[model samples]
Target: STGSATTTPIDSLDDAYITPVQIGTPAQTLNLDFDTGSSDLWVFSSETTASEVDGQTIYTPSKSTTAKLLSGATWSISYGDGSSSSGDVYTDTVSVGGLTVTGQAVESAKKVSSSFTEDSTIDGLLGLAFSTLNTVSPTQQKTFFDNAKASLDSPVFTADLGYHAPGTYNFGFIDTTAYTGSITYTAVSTKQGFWEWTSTGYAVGSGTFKSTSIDGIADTGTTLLYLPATVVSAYWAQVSGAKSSSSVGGYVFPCSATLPSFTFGVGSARIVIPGDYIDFGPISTGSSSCFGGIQSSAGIGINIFGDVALKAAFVVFNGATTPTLGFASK
Candidate 1:
């Protein structure tokens, strides 16, 4: 079987992306962030504390006849910003783009961090990372993809993120027409519970490429592109008046500043991110200073190729026996 779903950017700045997913017997639809960086299919549910839920949609597990509470099952996840969510688990019928998983594990949040509750547009997250990263215990649960792959015609999924526009996600098979030219494939290492890969080098603007081994993950869950401090500094150096501001939390420059194109290597292939994409947008309302989509990964142990980079091309998460990442220009 195959399925496709539309994903859309939530904020004006393309801060994050969300996709509609149907859950339970009566099919309560919710907009969930399809995050490839984590492994927990959690939702802001009716079980969540009243104060912990804002205007976001809540999954009503108790209302579903097929919903079965997992005995002694609990899951908790924390983000880098100290935001966290904890919840109980249930096995229920879930579907995305018509692809159904009859006994999928759905975590119902008992408590959610202020960051999630404050966002009215996002109901919860559907994790796409390795099932090894699942937080559920005493038994870790299988991810939606992991369980669906067995029945899919092909074990693959592609992420087509857009820049402030509606995107698409395809499961079971790749849309041959979605990208241009042939895809450049790379091996992935999931030892750390992430789709980790290394880039041969990077070029700031039109300059020469540096001979460096930059290890990073392909994460749709994140919004910005984070690289080594030196790389980030070099990229900003090309933009006049660019400064790394601790208060604002990243590199910022005049909105009118000239932004050079950013490029990175995947094997022998090169993917280019346009200059305008690097200019994230004004830091504040009416502020002349804008944030840079490319920032330093100093605090983060690994570099992250987030939506800023993902939106530039077609990306495939090939769930073969030997997993691989695929990229092609669109």
Candidate 2:
């Protein structure tokens, strides 16, 4: 599912259940990741050598004559895992689904890490999710969406994370088939690319969070759901058998029992996450229990609801469009 260029259903948190497509010809499909953590659409290039890319895809510039490059701009991105890469800027005629945008900026990494080079998935990541992290400089602050917003059918773009059997992700049009015509959208706060929202509180087993202002960001590119110390503590307090394990440095409950259900209160909506996430087993040497999927990241300041959180709902990323991101049910 992560390596092929065809669409495959996979489980996820935000963007809910989605079908990731392995991108081939622009005429057939355009692969995208709908990342809210970063801005920029990077693809592997044929110009990249195997030695430089340990486990990543290489984009063939020769494949698309329409590909263009910026005069002197260059880009590099560092991941939380300490891996990094650098590349030059190029422009190309790219299309997502049936929507085509001309002269979209593309990144061709000269060097890639094992995280990318080793993955057989599509060549690169197309960040269309809402966030202020635009790789395009201030002078050119308008990203692909900022530039192409005019041509989109609606100023709003919709993503249907169909995590059901096939786990297909659909962008652009709201699949009326999957959802009621009425879609609920959250307004974004300014100053950053992340979709900022307030969570009422954390819920375990029932609709618990009724009054707590939890400020956080929704991120799809990231793997785990990180919360503030206060939120994490409140959640563990509710579990009957939950214990503060010495091993993981946080509160951990035994996975022996059915994991209790939990949810994050986002505005009026309750974003629920399964208990298996809380049953995160030991990773390091000690058998210390760590919260399965949820972790403490107080220092990060921002709370990141990664794929684990998104798997519960459908998320929309509107770029080169009206810039409206719509969040809805499956």
Candidate 3:
């Protein structure tokens, strides 16, 4: 149950870094945001008194000897972009990188206010993307890839290094040398934990998805990429400083520069966003910008591809053997 720490460097399929390794002792390293949509492994706790969590990196729990405290249970999480965050409910000893998964249930949030508390380098959010939208369930069982998945060496992928600038989120194994080749598998639908897919519509560089009744729910607790206001107005009408900003209505541009490069395919798993996340923080604003990775949801019939479009692919979440969902290249 010990022997940890010493497995870090896993970023160079053009750098989308995951880092995540620190689960006790004096350890507390986090750069997380490895979501699969929403499972739960929340961080930022040094008892979190919340000043918007100031300089970030807080997860002490008395240096964990397998910290636990669900008795303080008081959780709150709301995001379909209405943005919300609350805290309490502890329990630690969560590690990544080389993988050491004991107890592993987490969520110390401590009242984070949108944009993830403005970042100290973002010391939290490691969702490994998958959701029936859980927030610790079944007698309190937290998942950091379901407690490390037998110390991962392969299946546990995410490559959303969407041209870095607060856009880099990569976790474990999938550096197939930055893709343009093979790796695609899909077969998982066991009653709403969601890996479900079937998209043949809305593509940008590999073009022609045209709409096959589009279906995609590859979430990471969603950061933007909800699509379906006619595919977010036909993907910001091909962005030319795309406009339509009713204060988060979907399609507001002026974060200035960096906008181009779009690709979305499921069968062969082709996810590429670049052009600085199609103008997200690439800003072009004087006061109006919201259409970068495709937004615009009013019916919310569920079509989330969040984390600004899964930080642009490499996601291979094979929940252990059969029941898979792989799409290669890190």
Candidate 4:
């Protein structure tokens, strides 16, 4: 079986992407971030406290006859930044695109961080990374893709994230028309529970390609691209007014400055991100300085090929026993 959903970017910076998912017997629909950085298909629901909810759609399990309580099951997951969500578990009929899983675990939020309530665009997150990252306790539950793996024609899902636009996320099968040129496949290290891999190197606009091994995770949940300080510095050096500011934080440049496109290698393939994407809009409404989409990962602990890079290519998250990552320009 195959499933397909339209992934839509939120805001002009394409800060995040969301897709529609249906849960329970009567189909309670919600827009969830299909995050490849973490695993736990959780949602904002009737179970969440009132003070924690505002302008967000809530999934009510009691409205569905197919919902069955997973008694004694409780879960909590946190972003290192302190943002988090926790809830009880239920087994229900869940569907995405046209695919359905009868016994999928649907975590309903009982508690959520303030950052969650601040954002009205997303109802919850549907983690797409390996089940090893699943946050459920007692017994770790399988992700939607994990439970549907046997039913999927192929044990794979593709991410085609767009820049301030709508894209597609496909399950079980690859869509040939979604990309251009042949895909470059590389192995992924899932030991850390991420779609982590190494790139051959990177190039700053038309500059020489640096033949260095850059390790990072393909994270759809994150908003920007993060690279080594060396690469980041070199990229900004090409621009006249770009600099790292402690006050503003991270890298910022003149809003009117001409930015360069970024390129990264996947084997023999070089995927290029257009300059418009790296602009990331202004720092504020009509601000003279703009934030860069690519920043140094020096203090970040690990580099991240987030939406900034992912949007430049069609990505494949292969869930096969021998996992791999595939990148193709589109």
> Top lDDT: which candidate number?
1
lDDT of 1 by residue, 16-107 (tens): 99899999999999999999999899999999999878899999998998999999999999975578999999999999998999999999
List the global CA lDDT of all models: 0.92, 0.57, 0.59, 0.91
Model 4, residue 77: distance off in Å is 1.0
Q: Which stretches of candidate 4 lie over 4 Å from their true place?
A: none
Better of 2 and 4 by lDDT: 4
Q: How far is 97's C-alpha from truth in model 3 (Å)?
A: 26
Worst 10 residues of 3 by lDDT: 1-10
The C-alpha TM-scores of every prediction are 0.98, 0.77, 0.32, 0.98
Report the C-alpha lDDT of model 4 over 80-107, residue by residue, as the tens digit: 4479999999999999999999988899
Clashing pairs in 4: none
lDDT for each residue of candidate 3 in 1-330, tens digit (9 for 90 to 100): 112222122222212234555756556666665556556667777766667776767787866767777774766666555656667777666665445666666777767775667656566766554544556533444466655655566545444334343333334465556555676876666456666666555566445756455676776555667766866676666667677766564566665544666566666456666656555443334545434656665578778766556556655566665556665544
From the highest lDDT down, the ranking of the candidates is 1, 4, 3, 2
lDDT of 2 at 126: 69
Residue 276 of model 1: what lDDT? 86
Candidate 2 is scored at a TM of: 0.77
